[model samples]
Every structure is written in C-alpha cells, then in structure tokens.
Target: STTIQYNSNYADYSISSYLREWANNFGDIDQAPAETKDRGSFSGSSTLFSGTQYAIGSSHSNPEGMIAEGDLKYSFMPQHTFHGQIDTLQFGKDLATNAGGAGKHLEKIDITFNELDLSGEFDSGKSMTENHQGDMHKSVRGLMKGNPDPMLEVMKAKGINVDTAFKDLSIASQYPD
Candidate 1:
C-alpha cells in the first residue's frame, strides 16, 4: 500500500468575515498582523503554496516559529520574487479597496504603495500568511541589499554583504530558491 501525503499540516484562515470587518474598521495591519518588505527589512523571493484549494487573495504570517513545524507538506511551492512575472500588490490593493477600503485606504494615508507590486514580508504577510500551523510558518526569501547583487547590480551602492543567505539554504534543501 502507498501512503498518500499532502500539505495536510496547514490551516485555512480564509479571509474571515470578522477579520475583514476588523480591517474595514481599522487600518491594514492593525486588525491584521503585518509582515513587510522595505528599505529596512526588505528581502527577495517569497514562498507561495499552490493547490486546488488555495487560491489568489489569501493572507497570514509566521516567524522563526515555522522552522520547528516539521516539513511543509505542500508541493509545487513557488518562491515569488520581485523579478517574477506577476504583480502581487495590485490585487491586494484591489481587495483592500473592494473589500471595503482595505485597498483604497492606502491612498487615504500619504504612505501608499502601488498595491500592484510588493516584496516578501508585506506582500506575503497579508496575502500569504492566511494559512498557519500553530503560529509557525516558514518560507525562503531573497537578500539583494548587498552593494553588488551580482545577479544585477549596475547602480547598486558599494560595500554590501552577499553571503550564504538564500542560496546556501537552497543547496541544503536540494532546491533552487
């Protein structure tokens, strides 16, 4: 007999009515937790789970707590990066707006991003972290703050640390991040 396995160790915190209401009343991350990517805590690549059940427009997050949660059972986990051929933020902003000001609210405040594009933390936090496993979630990301990204650094500043961050981990996992 063969044992059928899947990313069963997962939770579907599908945008609940309460959460949506909370977001409508409050700001983006106030009611909902915030993951993010910016000049200070910015990275590249984000983990995305694929399956018939999961769909676009989801949200959630986890910190070091994910590492202890055994191996993620989901397959075809795509690592979305800035370079990927997709605009993640646009959808979020749309949902934020259509979902009753969640998206449009960004404009109300002076601090607004395109909402069509995003990096890891912020982008993944709201739209990705919807699925949780006991407050522990894990995924890989890119680090391109180095002076010379090597991958692409024509106008990059100078003097940055580009060491075994994601690449090293990819080697360990036997998968290319």
Candidate 2:
C-alpha cells in the first residue's frame, strides 16, 4: 500500500508575472479584481463578481466574479490541504522538466477572505468572538502574504528579482453607500 502525501500549489499565482500583478495590486495601480469566471471551466482570467464592478483598482475588467478561476486540471498534491506557497498549472503540466512554464497569464485578482487558526497563539476562550467561534481570526487578503512577499524570498533564493513582469491585478473599490 502507498500513503498519499499532500502538497499544495498557489495555482497560477505563483508564476513571476502573476506574482508581480498580485504585488502591484497591493500597492499603487489600476483596477481589475481577481475572479473565477467559470467553476467547471478552465481558461482566461477568473471573472469578477457581477455586482463587484468598478475595476477593483486595476486596468483590466471582470464581469464574472472573484476567485482563482478555472480548476486545477490535476492535483499532484492532495485535497483539504493548505498551500504554503503558490504555483501554476503550466507548472504541473511541465513537471517532467520540474514544473515550468509561462502560465495562463491573467488580468484579475479576487480578494479571498481567509480564516486562520490562531489557536496556536491562544485558546478560543481567551480570544474574543461574536458566536463562540473565536479560536481563529479572519482576514480578507490575497492567497499569499508575508514580509516583502514570500515570492520575493523565492526570487532571492534563485538569485533573481533583478527584473519585472508585465501587467498586474488589483482591488480597491470604494463600497457604495
């Protein structure tokens, strides 16, 4: 019998171009929120939520919705797993050469609200909450977030980061009253 080892990829967000777009979205830029156009479909930038118009603070447009868009064709990893880092489909497609490719190239960014288990810091009883579910904290941000961005660390590890990539995605809409 063989045991299943779990590994997670950040989807297309890992590639250089996408990562730059993500990073740019974090700072000054245009509007174009991340969205998953099709749930069962696979292609193009994940469209943005319908009511979520206004270009999420980028140059592109998303009439669909927020999400990574398109599902992973294949998961070399496992399900119910948390991705510590982001990767790309072009990656798994080129695993023969060790996961390599230019990626699908996107133009949107969907801000995902994530709930983290900060229980490691304190018990649910110690933390404050509204309905007794206070063992974790919630934050609405990108799939990846760290000091200077973890991708930067990867770039440095490979002696890279001396260049820049085209176009990025963003989200900075002033919610209407």
Candidate 3:
C-alpha cells in the first residue's frame, strides 16, 4: 500500500478589516524651519505572525544640505521576523547665503501594522531617494471609499500565490536634500 503525506504547516489568509482601518490612517507630518538642522538615526527588530505594512507621505520645500539612508530585512520561518536600520539619517536647510527661506511645508507620513510579520506572500526589495531645492510632495495612499485595495490587487495581478510568495525580502534607500 502507498500513502501520500501532505504538509499542513502553511495556509492561506486574508488581511483583516481592523488591520485595514489602521493602514488607512497611517501617516507622518513634518514642517522644518529655514534655519533648522537635524540629524538622527533609528532602528528596530521584531517577530510577527501576519505581515508588515506601511504608508508614507513626504513633503518638503526649499530644503538643502540634507541626507538620509536606511535598510530593511525580512523573512519567514513559519513566522515573520524583520530588522530595520536607519543610518546616516540627516536633514537640514542650506547654509549658503543665497539659500531661500522655507515655505509653508508639511511632511505627512504614516505606517501601521498589527504585528511585524516579515513573511511569505509579501516578499519584496525596494530602494528610493528624493533630493530637491524647491517644492516636493510624495504620497502613497491605501484603499479608500469605492476603491479596491491597491497592494492586494498588485499581488493578484502579479500571479503570485499569497501562500508561498515572499519567503524573504530586503530594502534600502538614500536621499540628499
């Protein structure tokens, strides 16, 4: 007699409404002064059971002499785990005599997640940068009224099986202002 052994350690799942609500309202707002010079660094590590998610909105005006760098690593071992580091994170206005004044500015950014689930069905790597001396505005919005979930739609369109897609992921970024 022959028998087939099935693996039941993995299963399919959908994002919950509670998570969706939290994602919909994640953002950060920053307004810097013309003579402001700021520099700092941050990092974190965590384990999660679901997946990681974030939403961002960055706005700046007449910024100069600024720099930022960061990296992220995520993986799944039947559970989600991740590490994030922000190196050389710095920002400020130009010191030049002719540097213009900082205009009405607000950097709105937000991120939300129930648990830091760095796991399958969502593995990806990304690198980004933004540097300017004038006006700049960047935004990434989630689902709204009468609209579909952009992130989920992208995964489906890519023909990726949520159950076995992202086993590992990484991201890094650098910017000068």
Q: Rate residue 57 of model 1 by lDDT.
A: 23
Give the root-mean-square deviation of each candidate in angstroms.
Answer: 19.9, 16.4, 19.0
Give the least accurate 10-residue stretch of model 2, judged by summed lDDT. Answer: 89-98
Across residues 83-145, which tens digit of lDDT does each residue of candidate 2 receive?
Answer: 221121111111111123212322322322222111112232332333122111111122122
* RMSD score of candidate 2 (Å): 16.4
Q: How do the residues 1-177 of candidate 3 rate in per-residue lDDT, one tens digit apiece?
A: 111111122112222232243333321122333343222111222433211222112222232222222343333443222333222222123322222421111131111111212122222332222211101111011221212254444334434332331112112111211
The C-alpha local distance difference test score for the whole of candidate 2 amounts to: 0.24
Q: Give the 10-residue window scoring lowest on summed lDDT in candidate 3.
A: 131-140
Error of 3 at 164 (Å): 9.9
Report the lDDT of model 3 for residue 104: 17
For TM-score, candidate 1 versus 3, the one ahead is: 3
Clashing pairs in 3: 26-110, 27-109, 27-110, 28-108, 28-109, 28-110, 29-107, 30-107, 121-166
Please give the lDDT score for candidate 1: 0.20
Q: What TM-score fits each model?
A: 0.17, 0.22, 0.20
Clashes of each: 18, 22, 9
Report lDDT per candidate: 0.20, 0.24, 0.24
